[PDB]
Amino acid sequence: GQDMQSLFTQYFQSMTEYGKDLVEKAKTSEIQSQAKAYFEKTHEQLTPLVRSAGTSLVNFFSSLMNLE
Amino acid sequence: GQDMQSLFTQYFQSMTEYGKDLVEKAKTSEIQSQAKAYFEKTHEQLTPLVRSAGTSLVNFFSSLMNLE
Amino acid sequence: GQDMQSLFTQYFQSMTEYGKDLVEKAKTSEIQSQAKAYFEKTHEQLTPLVRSAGTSLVNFFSSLMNLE
Amino acid sequence: GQDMQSLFTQYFQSMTEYGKDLVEKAKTSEIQSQAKAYFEKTHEQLTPLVRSAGTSLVNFFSSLMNLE
Amino acid sequence: GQDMQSLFTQYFQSMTEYGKDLVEKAKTSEIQSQAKAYFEKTHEQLTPLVRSAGTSLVNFFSSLMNLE
Amino acid sequence: GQDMQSLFTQYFQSMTEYGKDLVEKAKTSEIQSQAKAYFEKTHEQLTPLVRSAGTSLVNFFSSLMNLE
Amino acid sequence: GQDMQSLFTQYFQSMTEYGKDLVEKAKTSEIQSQAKAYFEKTHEQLTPLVRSAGTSLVNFFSSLMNLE
Amino acid sequence: GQDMQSLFTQYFQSMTEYGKDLVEKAKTSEIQSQAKAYFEKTHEQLTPLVRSAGTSLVNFFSSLMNLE
Amino acid sequence: GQDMQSLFTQYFQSMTEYGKDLVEKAKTSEIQSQAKAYFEKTHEQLTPLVRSAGTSLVNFFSSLMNLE
Amino acid sequence: GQDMQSLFTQYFQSMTEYGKDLVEKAKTSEIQSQAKAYFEKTHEQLTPLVRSAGTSLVNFFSSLMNLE
Amino acid sequence: GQDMQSLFTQYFQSMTEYGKDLVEKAKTSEIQSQAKAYFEKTHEQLTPLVRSAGTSLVNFFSSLMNLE
Amino acid sequence: GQDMQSLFTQYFQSMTEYGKDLVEKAKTSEIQSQAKAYFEKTHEQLTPLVRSAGTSLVNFFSSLMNLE
Helix, strand or coil, X not given: CEEECCEEEEEECCEEEECCCEECXXXXXXXXXXXXXXXXXXXXXXXXXXXXXXXXXXXXXXXXCCEC | CEEECCEEEEEECXXXXXXXXXXXXXXXXXXXXXXXXXXXXXXXXECCEEECCCCCEEEEECCCCCEC | CEEECCEEEEEECCEEEEXXXXXXXXCCCEXXXXXXXXXXXXXXXXXXXXXXXXXXXXXXXXXXXXXX | CEEECCEEEEEECCEEEECCXXXXXXXXXXXXXXXXXXXXXXXXXXXCEEECCCCCEEEEECCCCCEC | CEEECCEEEEEECCEEEECCCEECCCCCCEECCCCCCCCXXXXXXXXXXXXXXXXXXXXXXXXXXXXX | CEEECCEEEEXXXXXXXXXXXXXXXXXXXXXXXXXXXXXXXXXXXXXXXXXCCCCCEEXXXXXXXXXX | CEEECCEEEEEECCEEEECCCEECCCCCCEECCCCCCCEECCEXXXXXXXXXXXXXXXXXXXXXXXXX | CEEECCEEEEEECCEEEECCCEECCCCCCEECCCXXXXXXXXXXXXXXXXXXXXXXXXXXXXXXXXXX | CEEECCEEEEEECXXXXXXXXXXXXXXXXXXXXXXXXXXXXXEEEECCEEECCCCCEEEEECCCCCEC | CEEEXXXXXXXXXXXXXXXXXXXXXXXXXXXXXXXXXXXXXXXXXXXXXXXXXXXXXXXXXXXXXXXX | CEEECCEEEEEECCEEEECCCEEXXXXXXXXXXXXXXXXXXXXXXXXXXXXXXXXXXEEEECXXXXXX | CEEECCEEXXXXXXXXXXXXXXXXXXXXXXXXXXXXXXXXCCEEEECCEEECCCCCEEEEECCCCCEC
16 A cells, blocks of 8 residues: 655755754863764664764665574 | 655755754864774674764665574 | 655755864864774674765665675 | 665755865864774674765665675 | 666756865874774675765675675 | 666756865874775775765676675 | 745645546537637736646736736 | 745656546537637737646746737 | 746656547537637737647746737 | 746656547547637737647747837 | 756656647548638737647747837 | 756656657548648748647847848
8 A cells, every 4th residue: 555654854935953963162071972882792683873963764674684 | 555765855945954063172072973992792783873964774675684 | 566765855945054074173182083993703784884964875675685 | 666765866946065074173183084993803794984975875686795 | 667776966056065075274183084994804795985975886786795 | 677776966057066175284194095004814895985076886787796 | 035936736655636627428518618709899917717737827026017 | 035936746656647628429519629719809918728737837027018 | 046937847656647638439529629710900918828738938037028 | 046947847767648639539520629710910929829748938038029 | 147947858767658649530520730720911929839749949038029 | 147948858768659640540531730721911920830749949149030
């Protein structure tokens, strides 16, 4: 049949600010850092770490993802 | 049948700022750093680390992804 | 049938700023660095690290990806 | 049938700035560096590290990718 | 049938700046450097490191890529 | 049937700047350097390191790529 | 500023029949006839006689239409 | 500023029948006839007689139309 | 500034029938006839008689049309 | 500035039938006839009689059309 | 500035039938006849009688058309 | 500045039938006849009678057309 699973934005005569990481002053600081650091024997299958108007669209159709 | 799974933006007569990482001052600081650091014997299958209006579209159709 | 899984942007009479990493001042700092650092015996299959209006479209159709 | 999985942008009478890494001042700093550093015995199969309006389109159709 | 998986841009009466790495001042700094550094016994199969409006289109059709 | 997987740009009455690495001042610095450095016993099969409006189109059709 | 005065239709995954004049049987009959017949000394300035999904878009901008 | 006065249709994964004049049987009949017949000393300035998915777009910009 | 006054259709993965005059049987009949017949001393300035997916785009810019 | 007044169709993976006058049977009949017949002392300036997917684009720019 | 007033069609992976006048049977009939018949002392300036996917593009730029 | 007023068709991987007048059977009939018949003292200046995928492009630039 009909299937619509989409990120559907439609702007008309509009003003839009979004997804904006803004630093004005930093000193000896760690500011807005997407990171993964220290993994040992880890098993991640679908782990999207997304930020600042980023996007991650995964369309698996009759698609196996087999880790053994 | 019909399948629409898409990142569908459509702008009309519009103004849009987005996905903007802005540093004005930095000193001895780590600011907005996408990173993965220190992995040992790790098994990642689908892990999109996305940022700042970036995109990641994966369309797997009848597609196996077998790690053994 | 019909399958549309696409990054579909369409601008009309519009103004759009996006995906902009901007440093004004940096000193002894690590600012906005996409990096992977120190991996040992790691097994990554589909790991897009994307940033700043970048894109990564993977279309696997009846496509095996077998790491053994 | 019909399959459209494409990066489809279409601009009309529009102004668009995007994917712009801009440094004004740098001193003893590492700013906006896409890097991979120190890998040992690693097994990466499909890992696009993309940035600044870059693109990576992989169309695997009935295509095996077998690392053993 | 019909398959369209393409990077399809079409500009009309438009102004577009994109994929622009700009340094104004640098001193003792490493700024915007795409690099791979120090690999030992690594097995990379499809790893596009792309930047600054660069592109990487891989069309594998009934194409094996077998590393053993 | 019909298969279109192409980098399709079409400009009309338009102005477009893109893929521009610009240094104004550099001193004791390493700025925008695409590099591969120090590999030992590495096995890379399809690794496009692309930058600054560069392109890399690989069309493998019924084409084996066997490293053993 | 911004002015949008347009016939804006946008269909998605939809089925639409419209503007359909259908005769199955006619005998000695006048069926669905757009006509103007017998005018004498008439002064028509903007008189759209439209039918069956037809359209008539008149965009007069700072445009005089002077009959004297 | 910005002015959009257009016949803007955009179909996606859709089926549309429109503007269809269909006669199956006619005898001694006048069926669906766009006509103007018998005018005497008439003064028509902008009179679009449109039918069956036809279109008539008139864009007069700072354009005089003076009948005297 | 920006002015878009256009007949803008854009079809994607769609099926569209339109503007179709179809006669199956006719006898002693006048079926779907665009006509103008018997004019005497008439003064028509802009009178588009359009039918069956036909089009008529008139773009008068700073253009006089003076009948005296 | 920017002015787009055009008949802009763009088909993608689509099927479109349009502007089709079809007679199957005719006898002693006048079917789908574009005609102008009997004019006396008439003064027509811009009168497009268009049919069956035909087109008529008139672009008058700073263009006088003076009948006196 | 920029001016685009054009008949802009662009087909991709598409099937399109249009502007097709088709007679199967005719007897003592006048079918689909573009004609002008009997004019006396007529003054036509711009009268395109167009049919069956025909086209008529008139580009008058600073062009006078003076009938006196 | 820039002026594009052109009949711009561009086909890609497409099938297109158009402008086709087809008679299968005719008897004592007048079928699809472009004609002008009986004119007396007529003054036609720009009257394109076009049919069946025919074209008529008139580009008058600073060009007078003076009938007196």
